[PDB]
Design a binder for this molecule. Structure first.
Ligand code: NAP
Ligand code: NAP
Ligand code: NMN
Ligand code: NMN
Ligand code: AKG
Ligand code: AKG
Ligand code: MG
Ligand code: MG
Lengths: 415, 415
């Protein structure tokens, strides 16, 4: 029995051809989220409604439709229902949705609902833009140098969840097969040993890299960097790099620079030469701090993208100002980079910036660019006014400390 | 037929009990290293010889014995011999050794010789101290806040090298077994799919964490942070965290703080309360930039330690000033954090600081603390004099740019 209420006065977004048809009164499903979701989400709704109202003076409005996942889903549907089938159906049906963060237990418990949503809806792109907002405090000297966009493969890798507990019959079964049937000798302690599988396919790699390159062309970006650990993980991470370059060559007419393997790809529109390069993952983490300007669009696998996202975000104010999207061929689910930060949950304390800027991406995705620009404007105003949440305040002299809801209002005031 | 010359005027280090017996004329095997190894190594020899000479006025001297691995090994022993059995034997025999960086091909070619040495000699500890040297340029505002020590598990993980090429019979064999015999459904594209194995055992975890805690006690450090991705990789990364805390409890009398899972461990000597805590790996990469002072000793797995090392190093000047050691129960091999940086190889351009400070660790390991202190002193002098190599120079106004050999001499001048 459905527990979701479909808004009376809204219309469904449709996908005519490959293009979205967004009506004036679109129904947008949202998930509140666990933990700080309770704080940041109400604030996102308020701010988005304001930007839409100001940009289009009543012509347009979102019909927000709440749907359930996580703790709240259990309180609605009964225990044990963490991810109602309805929810998956509703996001595919309505094409565009947004969520708060969801809690994943460490060491046991349910598998990540985030990963479940991503995998079940085949949202193979995790798109995370990291840019500096003028006036944002930062622990680095030149944050303005960081203007990157992460394309993170979202459907494979060690992130996929294929693993077995130490001392379990399954684990022992796999170990025996590895040792005896594959002649694997490189397992140092075969007893009391957990096992994980890391898959990486050509189709998975190329669909992610294709998207990254297209984004670079559509946005007149300077380069695309393949990030990988292919010297140690030759057949997964190194495969990723090989496939990525191969794709650039076969589908975008990529050409050698010198002896390579770096490529030049000519922007069909602007005619700019887009550089396709690669960097090893550990080195990259120094590179972003020491030579940020040399990097632009980033394409990487599931785990690496996760590490990179947080490290990059830190350069530019931290993950309270880090938006993202999970994007597939049939729908898109926007959400902040950060998680549920349970230790602050309910305190009206955290930065709603990340989820707000995710809605900003959603609006842009919807072609409501005017509303989106109002959000950006409001953000820059509020930050420049040095009226901010705890995470910014503690890196700053003479700032007024605002609560999460308050900072929401601050953003609106500066629209 | 051996190609190594055993020094006429030196004596072998021995391991009486659990303690090293270091003579006055110890024979120390060294490997030059590929790439920039050709630059940095000669410089390390010069600087170490100087520190030993000054500290002990001729009473002590190292009898350097060259041994072979990598490219140079092929030029000496013939093609195809990248890692002569001799070399493994010589390091175990002589107990203490040092190496330049070694090249690992990305996507194919030989497996990492570094990993080979580590695995073959069971050097399960990769120890990387990251501290700020006064006067070092940096892209962060407060580098002095970074004073950490990385304990990185060095014998397991995805780093172990258990993997198969996409479309290979072996890969297809493993995939079929996973799909059909283990009922694995979470592989998105089973065709054209590379596969990797990630093992993590209880014995491996605990021997690494034991070492980390002992180091914290022997050095009066504030805390030990377990870094892991145990919400996504429950049975490897999460197992690591569980075992680590369990060890702290069972072997060091660790006690709850509040409801935990953080522990208090009482320093037997100083009586200081050492905090045992944990942080998720992506979050940690923001944490080190945003709250560096809150971190001290780091214990993590093979891959994570690798990422963390480079990111931390960047905070403090980059990997031209990042020493490390690979340490086992029977011997220790010191080497810089950085690799072969082939693009600069032979140019006398890179910072020899990392390998030099690795020798600094080696000396300390040998109980030649006076010589070690001379190296530290020389380093601080040379850096404070703003006479430096390219990597520091480019982050600095009004510095004199020195070549690698020159900076070596600068260090000696400031002893
Ligand atoms: N996409 C997702 O839904 C997602 C992503 C990551 C994690 N998670 C889940 O979240 C749970 C806790 O993970 P975690 O503690 O490692 O990561 P986290 O919830 O992101 O929190 C880590 C730290 O990041 C900072 N932070 C996070 N959100 C912030 C905000 N809105 N404003 C300001 N600062 C913010 C805080 O740093 P300081 O306390 O240092 O100021 C926080 O303690 C886990 O169960 C995990 O599975 C979910
Ligand atoms: N323990 C080891 O032996 C080890 C460790 C890592 C990698 N490697 C091997 O090294 C090869 C190349 O790896 P990579 O290019 O990704 O890593 P890398 O050789 O460490 O070089 C990456 C970047 O780090 C900086 N850097 C490295 N060493 C430096 C020094 N002595 N002084 C100043 N800056 C330094 C340079 O940065 P900028 O050019 O930006 O100034 C360099 O381009 C690979 O085959 C890999 O297998 C070996
Ligand atoms: N062209 C490539 O494939 C490649 C590979 C590695 C580094 N790089 C960098 O790009 C630059 C290429 O310049 P040149 O080929 O004119 O020397 C170099 O300075 C180097 O730092 C290029
Ligand atoms: N004690 C633990 O196990 C644990 C767990 C997570 C965070 N913390 C941090 O340590 C502090 C513990 O302080 P109290 O238990 O007195 O509130 C908290 O402020 C919190 O930020 C502690
Ligand atoms: O699924 C989770 O709980 C964490 C996911 C995550 O870290 C991310 O992809 O941002
Ligand atoms: O083995 C290699 O080539 C790289 C090893 C590495 O990155 C490290 O452990 O520092
Ligand atoms: Mg994350
Ligand atoms: Mg490394």
């Amino acid at each position: 029995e459905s527990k979701v209420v479909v808004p009376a006065q809204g219309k469904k977004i449709t996908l005519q051809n490959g293009k979205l048809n967004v009506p004036e009164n679109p129904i947008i499903p949202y998930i509140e989220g666990d933990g700080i979701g309770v704080d940041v989400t109400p604030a996102m709704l308020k701010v988005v409604d304001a930007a839409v109202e100001k940009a289009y003076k009543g012509e347009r409005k979102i019909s927000w439709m709440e749907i359930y996942t996580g703790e709240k889903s259990t309180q609605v549907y009964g225990q044990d229902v963490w991810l109602p089938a309805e929810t998956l159906d509703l996001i595919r049906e309505y094409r565009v949705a947004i969520m708060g963060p969801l809690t994943t237990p460490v060491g046991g418990g349910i598998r990540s609902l985030n990963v479940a949503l991503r995998q079940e809806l085949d949202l193979y792109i995790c798109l995370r833009p990291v840019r500096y907002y003028q006036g944002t405090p930062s622990p680095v000297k030149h944050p303005e140098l960081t203007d990157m966009v992460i394309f993170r493969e979202n459907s494979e890798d060690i992130y996929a969840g294929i693993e077995w507990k130490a001392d379990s019959a399954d684990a022992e079964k796999v170990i025996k097969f590895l040792r005896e049937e594959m002649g694997v000798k490189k397992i140092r302690f075969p007893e009391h040993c957990g096992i994980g599988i890391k898959p990486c396919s050509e189709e998975g790699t190329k669909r992610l890299v294709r998207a990254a390159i297209e984004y670079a062309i559509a946005n007149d970006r300077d380069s695309v960097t393949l990030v990988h650990k292919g010297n140690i993980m030759k057949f997964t991470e190194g495969a990723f790099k090989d496939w990525g370059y191969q794709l650039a060559r076969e589908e975008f007419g990529g050409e050698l620079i010198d002896g390579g393997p770096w490529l030049k790809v000519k922007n069909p529109n602007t005619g700019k030469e887009i550089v396709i390069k690669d960097v090893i993952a550990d080195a990259f983490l120094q590179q972003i701090l020491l030579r940020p300007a040399e990097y632009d669009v980033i394409a990487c696998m599931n785990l690496n993208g996760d590490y990179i996202s947080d490290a990059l975000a830190a350069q530019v104010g931290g993950i309270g100002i880090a938006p993202g999207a999970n994007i597939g061929d049939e729908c898109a689910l926007f959400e902040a980079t950060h998680g549920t930060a349970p230790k602050y949950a309910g305190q009206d304390k955290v930065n709603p910036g990340s989820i707000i800027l995710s809605a900003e991406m959603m609006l842009r995705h919807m072609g409501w660019t005017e509303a989106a620009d109002l959000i950006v404007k409001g953000m820059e105003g509020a930050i420049n006014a040095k009226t901010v949440t705890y995470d910014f305040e503690r890196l700053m002299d003479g700032a007024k400390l605002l609560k999460c809801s308050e900072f929401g209002d601050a953003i609106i005031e500066n629209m």
